[PDB]
Enzyme design. Sequence first.
Site, mmCIF file in Angstrom:
data_model
loop_
_atom_site.group_PDB
_atom_site.id
_atom_site.type_symbol
_atom_site.label_atom_id
_atom_site.label_comp_id
_atom_site.label_asym_id
_atom_site.label_seq_id
_atom_site.Cartn_x
_atom_site.Cartn_y
_atom_site.Cartn_z
ATOM 1 C CG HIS F 18 -1.870 -1.006 1.428
ATOM 2 N ND1 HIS F 18 -1.777 -1.961 2.417
ATOM 3 C CD2 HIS F 18 -3.040 -1.247 0.787
ATOM 4 C CE1 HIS F 18 -2.822 -2.774 2.351
ATOM 5 N NE2 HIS F 18 -3.603 -2.370 1.362
ATOM 6 C CE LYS F 42 -12.863 -6.027 2.559
ATOM 7 N NZ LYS F 42 -11.572 -5.419 2.103
ATOM 8 C CB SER F 129 -4.053 -6.582 4.500
ATOM 9 O OG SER F 129 -3.582 -5.278 4.242
HETATM 10 C C1 LIG Z 1 -12.801 0.235 1.140
HETATM 11 C C2 LIG Z 1 -13.071 -0.313 -0.270
HETATM 12 C C3 LIG Z 1 -12.336 0.656 -1.205
HETATM 13 C C4 LIG Z 1 -12.415 -1.689 -0.477
HETATM 14 O O1 LIG Z 1 -11.032 -1.536 -0.222
HETATM 15 P P1 LIG Z 1 -10.120 -2.778 0.259
HETATM 16 O O2 LIG Z 1 -10.911 -3.536 1.294
HETATM 17 O O3 LIG Z 1 -8.746 -2.429 0.775
HETATM 18 O O4 LIG Z 1 -9.792 -3.367 -1.155
HETATM 19 P P2 LIG Z 1 -10.605 -4.640 -1.595
HETATM 20 O O5 LIG Z 1 -11.795 -4.781 -0.659
HETATM 21 O O6 LIG Z 1 -11.035 -4.446 -3.031
HETATM 22 O O7 LIG Z 1 -9.416 -5.751 -1.354
HETATM 23 C C5 LIG Z 1 -8.288 -5.459 -0.536
HETATM 24 C C6 LIG Z 1 -7.533 -6.693 -0.016
HETATM 25 O O8 LIG Z 1 -6.372 -6.839 -0.817
HETATM 26 C C7 LIG Z 1 -5.158 -6.711 -0.063
HETATM 27 N N1 LIG Z 1 -4.634 -5.294 -0.183
HETATM 28 C C8 LIG Z 1 -5.117 -4.377 -1.117
HETATM 29 N N2 LIG Z 1 -4.154 -3.629 -1.739
HETATM 30 C C9 LIG Z 1 -2.984 -4.044 -1.217
HETATM 31 C C10 LIG Z 1 -1.652 -3.645 -1.449
HETATM 32 N N3 LIG Z 1 -1.344 -2.759 -2.396
HETATM 33 N N4 LIG Z 1 -0.635 -4.240 -0.714
HETATM 34 C C11 LIG Z 1 -0.931 -5.204 0.236
HETATM 35 N N5 LIG Z 1 -2.238 -5.595 0.453
HETATM 36 C C12 LIG Z 1 -3.270 -5.037 -0.249
HETATM 37 C C13 LIG Z 1 -5.530 -7.191 1.350
HETATM 38 O O9 LIG Z 1 -5.677 -8.633 1.602
HETATM 39 C C14 LIG Z 1 -6.836 -6.398 1.315
HETATM 40 O O10 LIG Z 1 -7.566 -6.318 2.511
HETATM 41 P P3 LIG Z 1 -8.463 -7.395 3.312
HETATM 42 O O11 LIG Z 1 -7.810 -8.761 3.373
HETATM 43 O O12 LIG Z 1 -8.671 -6.596 4.583
HETATM 44 O O13 LIG Z 1 -9.797 -7.524 2.603
HETATM 45 C C15 LIG Z 1 -14.548 -0.453 -0.575
HETATM 46 O O14 LIG Z 1 -15.126 -1.533 0.146
HETATM 47 C C16 LIG Z 1 -15.363 0.783 -0.282
HETATM 48 O O15 LIG Z 1 -15.359 1.803 -1.182
HETATM 49 N N6 LIG Z 1 -16.056 0.871 0.863
HETATM 50 C C17 LIG Z 1 -16.811 2.058 1.227
HETATM 51 C C18 LIG Z 1 -18.306 1.862 1.106
HETATM 52 C C19 LIG Z 1 -18.707 1.984 -0.364
HETATM 53 O O16 LIG Z 1 -18.607 3.057 -1.010
HETATM 54 N N7 LIG Z 1 -19.145 0.851 -0.924
HETATM 55 C C20 LIG Z 1 -19.595 0.853 -2.338
HETATM 56 C C21 LIG Z 1 -18.346 0.730 -3.170
HETATM 57 S S1 LIG Z 1 -18.807 0.443 -4.924
#
Ligand SMILES: CC(C)(COP(=O)(O)OP(=O)(O)OC[C@H]1O[C@@H](n2cnc3c(N)ncnc32)[C@H](O)[C@@H]1OP(=O)(O)O)[C@@H](O)C(=O)NCCC(=O)NCCS
Lengths: 157, 156, 156, 156, 156, 156
Positions: F18, F42, F129
Site C-alpha cells: 500500500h 469484513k 494484508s
Molecule cells: C474500502 C473499499 C475501497 C475496499 O477496499 P479494500 O478492502 O482495501 O480493497 P478490496 O476490498 O477491493 O481488497 C483489498 C484486499 O487486498 C489486499 N490489499 C489491497 N491492496 C494491497 C496492497 N497494495 N498491498 C498489500 N495488500 C493489499 C488485502 O488482503 C486487502 O484487505 P483485506 O484482506 O482486509 O480484505 C470499498 O469496500 C469501499 O469503497 N467501501 C466504502 C463503502 C462503499 O462506497 N461501498 C460501495 C463501493 S462500490
Amino acid sequence: MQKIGIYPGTFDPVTNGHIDIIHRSSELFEKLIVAVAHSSAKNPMFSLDERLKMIQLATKSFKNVECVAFEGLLANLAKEYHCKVLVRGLRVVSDFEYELQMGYANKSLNHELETLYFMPTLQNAFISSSIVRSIIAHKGDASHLVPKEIYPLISKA
Amino acid sequence: MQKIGIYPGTFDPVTNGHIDIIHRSSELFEKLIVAVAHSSAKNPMFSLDERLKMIQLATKSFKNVECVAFEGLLANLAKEYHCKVLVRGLRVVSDFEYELQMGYANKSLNHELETLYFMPTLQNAFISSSIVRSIIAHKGDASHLVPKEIYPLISK
Amino acid sequence: MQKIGIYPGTFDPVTNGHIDIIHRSSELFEKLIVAVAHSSAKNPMFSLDERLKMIQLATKSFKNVECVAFEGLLANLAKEYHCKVLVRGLRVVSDFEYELQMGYANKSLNHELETLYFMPTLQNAFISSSIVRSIIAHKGDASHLVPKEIYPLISK
Amino acid sequence: MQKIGIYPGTFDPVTNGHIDIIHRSSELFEKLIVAVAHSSAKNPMFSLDERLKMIQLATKSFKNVECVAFEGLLANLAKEYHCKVLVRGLRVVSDFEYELQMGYANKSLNHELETLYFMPTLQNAFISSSIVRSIIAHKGDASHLVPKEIYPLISK
Amino acid sequence: MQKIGIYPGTFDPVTNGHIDIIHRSSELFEKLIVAVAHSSAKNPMFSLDERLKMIQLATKSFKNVECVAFEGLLANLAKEYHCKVLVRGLRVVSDFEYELQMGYANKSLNHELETLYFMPTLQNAFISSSIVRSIIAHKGDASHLVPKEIYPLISK
Amino acid sequence: MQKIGIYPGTFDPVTNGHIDIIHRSSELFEKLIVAVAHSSAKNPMFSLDERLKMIQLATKSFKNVECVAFEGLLANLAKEYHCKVLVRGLRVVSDFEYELQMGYANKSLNHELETLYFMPTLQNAFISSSIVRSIIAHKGDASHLVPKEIYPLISK
Ligand SMILES: CC(C)(COP(=O)(O)OP(=O)(O)OC[C@H]1O[C@@H](n2cnc3c(N)ncnc32)[C@H](O)[C@@H]1OP(=O)(O)O)[C@@H](O)C(=O)NCCC(=O)NCCS
Ligand SMILES: CC(C)(COP(=O)(O)OP(=O)(O)OC[C@H]1O[C@@H](n2cnc3c(N)ncnc32)[C@H](O)[C@@H]1OP(=O)(O)O)[C@@H](O)C(=O)NCCC(=O)NCCS
Ligand SMILES: CC(C)(COP(=O)(O)OP(=O)(O)OC[C@H]1O[C@@H](n2cnc3c(N)ncnc32)[C@H](O)[C@@H]1OP(=O)(O)O)[C@@H](O)C(=O)NCCC(=O)NCCS
Ligand SMILES: CC(C)(COP(=O)(O)OP(=O)(O)OC[C@H]1O[C@@H](n2cnc3c(N)ncnc32)[C@H](O)[C@@H]1OP(=O)(O)O)[C@@H](O)C(=O)NCCC(=O)NCCS
Ligand SMILES: CC(C)(COP(=O)(O)OP(=O)(O)OC[C@H]1O[C@@H](n2cnc3c(N)ncnc32)[C@H](O)[C@@H]1OP(=O)(O)O)[C@@H](O)C(=O)NCCC(=O)NCCS
Ligand SMILES: CC(C)(COP(=O)(O)OP(=O)(O)OC[C@H]1O[C@@H](n2cnc3c(N)ncnc32)[C@H](O)[C@@H]1OP(=O)(O)O)[C@@H](O)C(=O)NCCC(=O)NCCS
C-alpha cells in the site's frame, strides 16, 4: 510526473475504446503523447502511416494530445520525451498479468518509468481492434466501434 | 520417480526464470534432462542448434543436468528416458488452465507420466522469453534477463 | 529436498482429490508428512481431532505417510521437520496467483522452504472439500467424493 | 428461439469435446446447424472442405443436425437462418471474457442474436483441437480425442 | 430439455442482471422455475421470505416464470420438476471455473442434470447483488441496479 | 483530475505494497487523501481507530498526503472532497474483474468519478494484508511486510 504521459499502442485501427483512454488521460496530463508502434512482428492490417494518420485525425479535438510513430523501444522513447509515465487501458479482455509483466519489463529498461491504467467507458469495455479487423475482413459494418471520421478509410482499406 | 525428471521447453532463449526452475528441480531429482523442443510451429527466433547450445552453456554448473534436443512427442521422449515426471515452472503469466490441460494430455499419451510444478524466484516471476526477444529485436539490452553465458550469442 | 515433504491443509474433510495428491507426492519423497492445520479462523465443519482421525484412516495404506495436527506457522513446522519442501495440489478451481503468493510468503518466513505442486487425476480435478460440506449440510450423499474409510464418520 | 440454433466453429478437426456440445445442444433445439467457418486468418491444418466432411461424418447419428460451411459474418448467417441463438461450448481452457466479448460483438451485429453456452462431459473438459493438431503434427496417435468416423480421414 | 429450466440463486436481492437472465431463459423454455435457495451459510441480508416476494414481484410480467423457495439440494429439486437443465448467468465477475465445478457437482448428484449459461445485457454485465447490498448498507441509492418494483422494499 | 485523488482501503493493516501505491500516487497528484473505510462487514482485525493511526504513522513522510477515516459511501466522500479520481493498486492477486466492476459501480454513484490504477514495486507484488494477519495471528514476525513505524502496533 503530471507534465507528460505516453499512451502507446499499435492502434490497428484506433477504436472508440482507445479514444476513451485518450480522453481521460489527456485530462490528467499536461501533455499526452500517443505513440503508435510499428509493431512489424504483429502483422498490422493498416500501415504505420494509415494508423498514425487515423489516430491523429481522431484526436484533433484534444488540444494537448500529439500523436507520433516510433520504431524502437518504448522505454527509450519515454527517455527522449523525459516522460516517467506510460498510460495503458484496462478492459474486460485485458491480460492483466501480462500488463503487470510489461510494466515491470519497461521499468527494468528505464528505472524511472511507471505505468498507470485507465478504464474506458462501460459501453466500450468489450471493444477491441481485433473485433473491428474481423468485421471489416468479412465485409461487415464496424462503424459502431470506431470514430466516424476514420470509418470510410477502414471500411475500404 | 525421483530418479529422473524432464524439464521441456522451447527455450527461445533460455532466461533467468528457466534457470531458477533448473536449479530447483535439479536439487530434487537424481538426474534432470532439460529437453529443448524443435517447436517449428512457434516460429522461434533462435534455431534449435542455437537454443540447445545456449542451454548447454547456461547449465554447465549443474552436474546432474543433461540437455537434449528433441523432435517428436514429449510423452514418447519420457518413455525413451524411462522417466515418469515432467517438470514445469509456474510464473505469474503462466496459463494455469493450459498447464493443467497439457499435463492431462501428456498423461493420456503416456499413462505413467506425471507433471510436477516449481516456482522461480520472486524476482524472476514476471520474466518471459517473449520479453527478451522483443528487447533483442529492438536492439536493446536484455542482459539483466538471461544467464551471462548466453548474452554474447543473443546480443550480436 | 527428497528426504521429506509436507502436505498441509485444513482437510475439512479429506477428499478423493487430497488422496490423489498424497498418492503422487508420497511416491516422490522418502517421508510425506500430512499436516492438518487447526484453521480456527476458517470455521471447519469437523473438529481438528475428527479431521486428523479421518486423514489417518484414509492414508493407512501409504506406509511412508505420517499425519500430524499443528497449531502454529507452517514455515516453522517445516523447520522442526528439517523439511525444505511444501506439497500443494493444483486443481481446476485453484487460485493460482494466491498459491504463488503463499509460496513466496512461506519462503519469506523460512528461506529454505520451496513449494512444489502436483495435479490430481482428471476425474478429481473439480472436487473440493466445500462441495462435500454443502452436500453433507443438505443430507445428501457425498460418498462418491471422499475415501470409503471416512464415509461413516462424515455421514451422521 | 427453440426452433433453431447455430453451433459455429473452425472445427480443425472436430473433437470429442465438440461432439458433446452437439449432443447436448441438438437435444435442446428442434434443428441444430453446425456451421464450419473458413477461418483463413487462423491457419487451419485441414481445408474447409475436409473440415466440413469430418463433422458431417461425425454427426450422421444426430438426425436434427445439419452441417454447413460459411465464409462471411456469422451474425449474417444467423439472419439467413432466422436463428436467434448461437451455441458455444465452455471448457476448462475457455477464455471466458473473450466469449462474453464475442457474444456482445455478435449482438451488436445482429440485435436478435443471443449466445447460450453448454459444457462438455467432464472427461472431455480438457480436450482442444490444438492438442489433436499437435499430436498429429508430431506423428502421434490422437484417436482417443476424436470421433472414430473422422479418424481414417485424419491420417491422409 | 426444452420443457423446463430451473434458474437457482440466493437473489439477495434480485438485480437487473438476474432479470436479464430470466428474460433470456424464459424465451427459451416452455416453463422457467426461479428457485430461491435458503443459503443460510451466506448470511443473506434479506430473509428467504423477502427474497422470494421480491423476485415474485420483479417477475410478474413473465407469464411462464414461476418462483419458488427451496431448502435442500438443487439436484433433488430438479427431480421433482422432471427438469434436466439448470440455468446460470455468466457475467464479468463470474468465477468461470467454479461454475464448471458446480455444474459437474450437480451432474454427479443427478446424472440427467445439465447446466446451460446465458449472458445478461452488456449494461448489466458488471452488476452484482453484493454491490446492491453495499450501497443499501451505506444508505445510498441503488435504484439503477434493481427492478423498480422492489426498490421501495430494499431502500435505506 | 490532477489536483486531488483519493486512495481508499480497509488497510487492515497497511502494508509495504500500500505504501508503494501511496508513494507513486502522491507523486502524481497535488494532494492525496488516504481514506480508511470502516469496513465493518469484513470484521477487520484492527479497529478503525487503530487502522487510521497506522496509516497516519506510515504516511508522515509524504507531505501532501492526509489520512481520514470514513463510514459512508466512497462515491459521496469523493464529492465531499471535490475529487473526481479514485486511486487503486493492481497486484498479482488483484481480482481484476472485480476492480473494473467496482470502478463502474462508483461511476454509477458519482458520474464524474474515474478510477486510476498504479502498480506496487515488483518486490511487493505478492504482499497482502491477509498474509500479514495470518502471520501475526500465529505470533510470527511480519516485520518484513509492513512499514517499520507500525510494526509495534500489530505485533502479537
Ligand atoms: C474500502 C473499499 C475501497 C475496499 O477496499 P479494500 O478492502 O482495501 O480493497 P478490496 O476490498 O477491493 O481488497 C483489498 C484486499 O487486498 C489486499 N490489499 C489491497 N491492496 C494491497 C496492497 N497494495 N498491498 C498489500 N495488500 C493489499 C488485502 O488482503 C486487502 O484487505 P483485506 O484482506 O482486509 O480484505 C470499498 O469496500 C469501499 O469503497 N467501501 C466504502 C463503502 C462503499 O462506497 N461501498 C460501495 C463501493 S462500490
Ligand atoms: C505497442 C505496445 C505498447 C503494445 O501495444 P498494443 O499492441 O496496442 O497493446 P497490446 O498489444 O497489449 O493490446 C493488444 C490488443 O488490444 C486491443 N486494444 C487495446 N486497447 C484497446 C482499447 N482501449 N479499445 C479497443 N481496443 C484495444 C486490440 O485488439 C489490440 O491490438 P491488436 O489486436 O492489434 O494486437 C508494445 O508492443 C510496445 O511497447 N512495443 C514497442 C517495442 C517495445 O518497447 N517492446 C518491449 C516492451 S516491454
Ligand atoms: C515444448 C513444450 C513443452 C512447450 O514448452 P514451452 O514452449 O517453453 O512452454 P509453453 O509453450 O507452454 O510457453 C512457454 C513460454 O513461456 C515463457 N517461458 C516459460 N517458462 C519460463 C520461465 N520460467 N522464465 C522465462 N520464460 C519462460 C516464454 O515466453 C515461453 O516461450 P515462447 O514465448 O517462445 O513460447 C510443448 O510444446 C511440447 O511438449 N512440445 C513437443 C511436442 C509435443 O509433445 N506436443 C504435445 C504436448 S501435449
Ligand atoms: C492450512 C493452509 C496450508 C491452507 O490449507 P487449506 O485450507 O486446505 O488450503 P487453502 O486454504 O489454500 O484452500 C484449499 C481449499 O481447497 C479445497 N481442497 C484443497 N485441495 C483439495 C483437493 N486436492 N481436492 C479436493 N479439495 C481440496 C478445500 O475446499 C480447501 O479449503 P476449505 O476447507 O476452506 O473449503 C494454510 O492456511 C496454513 O499454512 N495455515 C497454517 C498457518 C500459517 O502458516 N499461516 C501462514 C501461511 S503463509
Ligand atoms: C468460427 C468462430 C465462431 C470461432 O470459432 P472457433 O475457432 O472454433 O472457436 P474460437 O476461435 O473462439 O477458439 C476455440 C478453439 O478451441 C476449439 N474448441 C472449441 N470448443 C471445443 C471443444 N468443445 N472441444 C475441443 N476443442 C474445442 C475450437 O475449434 C478452436 O480451435 P482452434 O483455434 O485451435 O482451431 C468465429 O471466428 C466466427 O464467428 N467466424 C465467422 C466470422 C465472423 O463473424 N467474425 C466476427 C465474429 S464477432
Ligand atoms: C443457490 C446456489 C445456486 C448458488 O447461487 P448464488 O448464491 O446466487 O450464485 P453463487 O453463490 O454461485 O454466486 C452468486 C453471486 O453473484 C452475484 N449474482 C449472481 N448472478 C448475478 C447476476 N446475473 N446479476 C447480478 N448479481 C448476480 C451476487 O453477488 C451473488 O450472490 P451473493 O453476493 O448473495 O453471494 C447454490 O448454492 C445451491 O444450489 N444451493 C442449494 C443447495 C445445493 O444444492 N448445494 C449444492 C450445489 S452443488
